[PDB]
Design an enzyme around this catalytic site. Structure first.
Site, mmCIF file in Angstrom:
data_model
loop_
_atom_site.group_PDB
_atom_site.id
_atom_site.type_symbol
_atom_site.label_atom_id
_atom_site.label_comp_id
_atom_site.label_asym_id
_atom_site.label_seq_id
_atom_site.Cartn_x
_atom_site.Cartn_y
_atom_site.Cartn_z
ATOM 1 N N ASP A 138 0.141 -7.562 2.022
ATOM 2 C CA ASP A 138 0.636 -6.156 1.935
ATOM 3 C C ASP A 138 2.187 -6.158 1.947
ATOM 4 O OD1 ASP A 138 0.520 -3.350 1.947
ATOM 5 O OD2 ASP A 138 0.113 -3.224 4.080
ATOM 6 N N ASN B 63 18.266 12.216 10.528
ATOM 7 C CA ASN B 63 17.354 13.409 10.448
ATOM 8 C C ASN B 63 16.905 13.418 8.969
ATOM 9 O OD1 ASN B 63 16.317 16.034 9.942
ATOM 10 N ND2 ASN B 63 17.381 16.826 11.619
ATOM 11 N N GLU C 247 24.090 9.619 3.881
ATOM 12 C CA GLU C 247 22.903 9.381 3.041
ATOM 13 C C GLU C 247 23.262 8.970 1.632
ATOM 14 O OE1 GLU C 247 23.380 12.336 4.652
ATOM 15 O OE2 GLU C 247 21.534 12.927 5.574
ATOM 16 N N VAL D 291 17.575 17.024 7.178
ATOM 17 C CA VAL D 291 18.975 17.582 7.112
ATOM 18 C C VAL D 291 19.961 16.627 6.488
ATOM 19 C CG1 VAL D 291 20.977 18.412 8.494
ATOM 20 C CG2 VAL D 291 18.563 18.867 9.216
ATOM 21 N N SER E 88 4.352 2.943 8.175
ATOM 22 C CA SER E 88 3.968 1.865 7.203
ATOM 23 C C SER E 88 5.105 1.494 6.283
ATOM 24 C CB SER E 88 2.841 2.291 6.242
ATOM 25 O OG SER E 88 1.638 2.496 6.994
ATOM 26 N N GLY E 89 5.243 0.227 6.044
ATOM 27 C CA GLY E 89 6.308 -0.285 5.144
ATOM 28 C C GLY E 89 7.594 -0.579 5.860
ATOM 29 N N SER F 51 3.125 1.626 16.395
ATOM 30 C CA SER F 51 3.714 2.241 15.211
ATOM 31 C C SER F 51 2.488 3.122 14.820
ATOM 32 C CB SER F 51 4.095 1.122 14.185
ATOM 33 O OG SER F 51 2.998 0.218 14.094
ATOM 34 N N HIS G 294 0.803 -1.218 0.000
ATOM 35 C CA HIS G 294 0.000 0.000 0.000
ATOM 36 C C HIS G 294 0.843 1.278 0.000
ATOM 37 C CE1 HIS G 294 0.134 0.264 4.638
ATOM 38 N NE2 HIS G 294 0.177 1.519 4.316
ATOM 39 N N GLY H 58 3.069 6.898 8.816
ATOM 40 C CA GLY H 58 4.418 7.394 8.457
ATOM 41 C C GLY H 58 5.381 6.220 8.678
ATOM 42 N N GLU I 280 19.912 7.416 6.580
ATOM 43 C CA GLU I 280 19.288 8.591 7.217
ATOM 44 C C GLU I 280 19.040 8.512 8.694
ATOM 45 O OE1 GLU I 280 17.666 11.456 4.116
ATOM 46 O OE2 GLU I 280 18.538 11.315 6.063
HETATM 47 N N1 LIG Z 1 -1.667 1.698 14.523
HETATM 48 C C1 LIG Z 1 -0.684 1.249 13.771
HETATM 49 N N2 LIG Z 1 0.145 0.318 14.207
HETATM 50 C C2 LIG Z 1 -0.490 1.756 12.480
HETATM 51 C C3 LIG Z 1 0.596 1.284 11.681
HETATM 52 C C4 LIG Z 1 0.862 1.745 10.388
HETATM 53 C C5 LIG Z 1 0.014 2.683 9.907
HETATM 54 N N3 LIG Z 1 -0.013 3.313 8.780
HETATM 55 C C6 LIG Z 1 -1.011 4.126 8.836
HETATM 56 C C7 LIG Z 1 -1.395 4.925 7.763
HETATM 57 C C8 LIG Z 1 -2.385 5.898 7.938
HETATM 58 C C9 LIG Z 1 -2.804 6.706 6.900
HETATM 59 C C10 LIG Z 1 -2.240 6.562 5.651
HETATM 60 C C11 LIG Z 1 -1.240 5.596 5.408
HETATM 61 C C12 LIG Z 1 -0.692 5.460 4.127
HETATM 62 C C13 LIG Z 1 -1.515 5.328 2.997
HETATM 63 C C14 LIG Z 1 -0.979 5.206 1.712
HETATM 64 C C15 LIG Z 1 0.405 5.210 1.536
HETATM 65 C C16 LIG Z 1 1.229 5.335 2.640
HETATM 66 C C17 LIG Z 1 0.690 5.458 3.909
HETATM 67 C C18 LIG Z 1 -0.829 4.789 6.481
HETATM 68 O O1 LIG Z 1 0.173 3.850 6.283
HETATM 69 C C19 LIG Z 1 -1.720 4.118 9.935
HETATM 70 C C20 LIG Z 1 -1.041 3.184 10.617
HETATM 71 C C21 LIG Z 1 -1.333 2.745 11.914
HETATM 72 CA CA LIG Z 2 19.360 13.443 6.626
#
Ligand SMILES: NC(=[NH2+])c1ccc2[nH]c(-c3cccc(-c4ccccc4)c3[O-])cc2c1
Ligand SMILES: [Ca+2]
Ligand SMILES: [Cl-]
Length: 223
Positions: free
Chosen positions: A84, A54, A62, A57, A177-178, A172, A40, A175, A52
């Site tokens: 996923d 920071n 990097e 910066v 995710s992945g 987590s 996703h 931000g 990375e």
């Molecule tokens: N509670 C958790 N452990 C959790 C973990 C990963 C997550 N990712 C996200 C998330 C929320 C909104 C948009 C994206 C998103 C959508 C598309 C592309 C990249 C990130 C998220 O990964 C929520 C989120 C919540």
């Molecule tokens: Ca940096």
């Protein structure tokens, strides 16, 4: 990462930031030319940023490399987030050293109770948005399948696992995710989803990487 701590510069050398003019997802380096992230997080125009700390910066270490192709798992379902996982091939290989290193894929799945390290530049607030400049870390255990299914009835497939704290406070978040979930030096999970962040009885859900090792190996071997 909510309730975590500052990792310390380059202490998580396999962590990458996926960038398209801003940081939108994390990922893990598994060899010098391939990264594993979540399906996703797919989009075009991805620049992978290695070494990375920071992300706003340039501090040195990097390496910014463009993705040559991203391979979303063919059975990825965007409504359930089943499968996923995505592989990203880099345009050129990265220079591995002590600050940029790959993480090993597992040979077996992990058991409930295993303590893992989750990292990322995601939101640090459960109620609001506060994005950090440097990498955050969280140590969290893998939960049993019964606790996971009892928390998310009907939404956990065999390709997912829960990790975290049912009392809330540490998780987590967006931000992250992945990104990586590493246990005993092997990449066991990929940050996938959760209901809110760090809420009570709503642990995070991760892609169970041990179920995709032959797929990752075969796909890399043919690309
Ligand atoms: N509670 C958790 N452990 C959790 C973990 C990963 C997550 N990712 C996200 C998330 C929320 C909104 C948009 C994206 C998103 C959508 C598309 C592309 C990249 C990130 C998220 O990964 C929520 C989120 C919540
Ligand atoms: Ca940096
Ligand atoms: Cl169920």
């Amino acid at each position: 990462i909510v309730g975590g701590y500052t990792c310390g510069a380059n202490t998580v050398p396999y962590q990458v930031s996926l960038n398209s003019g801003y940081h939108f997802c994390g990922g893990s380096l598994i060899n010098s030319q391939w990264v594993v992230s979540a399906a996703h997080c797919y989009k075009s125009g991805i620049q992978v940023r290695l070494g990375e700390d920071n992300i706003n910066v340039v501090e040195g270490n990097e390496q910014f490399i463009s993705a040559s192709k991203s391979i979303v798992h063919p059975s990825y379902n965007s409504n359930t987030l089943n499968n996923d996982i995505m592989l990203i091939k880099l345009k050129s290989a990265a220079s591995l050293n002590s600050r940029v290193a790959s993480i090993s894929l597992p040979t077996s799945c992990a058991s409930a109770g295993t303590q893992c390290l989750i990292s990322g530049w995601g939101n640090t607030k459960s109620s609001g948005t506060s994005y950090p400049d440097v990498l955050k870390c969280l140590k969290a255990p893998i939960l049993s399948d019964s606790s996971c299914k009892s928390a998310y009835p009907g939404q956990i497939t065999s390709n997912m696992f829960c990790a975290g704290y049912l009392e809330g406070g540490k998780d987590s978040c967006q931000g992250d995710s992945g990104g990586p979930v590493v246990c005993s030096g092997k990449l066991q999970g990929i940050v996938s989803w959760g209901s809110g962040c760090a809420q009570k009885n709503k642990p995070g859900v991760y892609t169970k990487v041990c179920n995709y090792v032959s797929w990752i190996k075969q796909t890399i071997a043919s690309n």
